[PDB]
């Protein structure tokens, strides 16, 4: 149960942390800015755990192994 | 594909909407405040079609109904 609790927590952080760096981008493309959401965004990289962040990490890289013909890895 | 094309589109919208408008609660929890991020917002409002748009308001009250044990007359 207290892994479940961190599932939830650390999900709500990763989904936060993305909000607003999406949010950002798109004020930064529209001309004005705000680098106040940047201040809140990198709190969250604080907040997410080590092992988590690893995880959306490598998930990029991990569709691209499992798109192929092979699973190149053996 | 017509319909197809327009799922990612409005999809997309519907993401930058719901982007927005949270990262602006977490500003404004955090004090300062970027009412551009409003603007945006309400852009996305009109640029998601009135069919999308009753579809995500009527989501909540959706899920409350296939949520008891009953399906309410009939």
Do not use: F, N
Request: net charge neutral; hydrophobic share 40%.
């Amino acid at each position: 149960r207290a892994y479940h609790r961190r599932v939830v927590a650390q999900s709500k952080l990763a989904r936060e942390r993305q909000q607003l760096r999406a949010a950002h981008d798109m004020l930064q493309g529209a001309g004005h800015e705000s680098a106040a959401l940047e201040t809140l965004a990198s709190e969250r990289d604080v907040s997410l755990g080590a092992v988590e962040r690893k995880l959306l990490a490598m998930w990029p890289q991990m569709q691209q192994a499992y798109s192929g013909d092979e699973y190149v890895v053996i | 594909r017509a319909y197809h094309r327009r799922v990612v589109a409005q999809s997309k919208l519907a993401r930058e909407r719901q982007q927005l408008r949270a990262a602006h609660d977490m500003l404004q929890g955090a004090g300062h405040e970027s009412a551009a991020l409003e603007t945006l917002a309400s852009e996305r409002d009109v640029s998601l079609g009135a069919v999308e748009r009753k579809l995500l308001a009527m989501w909540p009250q959706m899920q409350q109904a296939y949520s008891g044990d009953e399906y309410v007359e009939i």
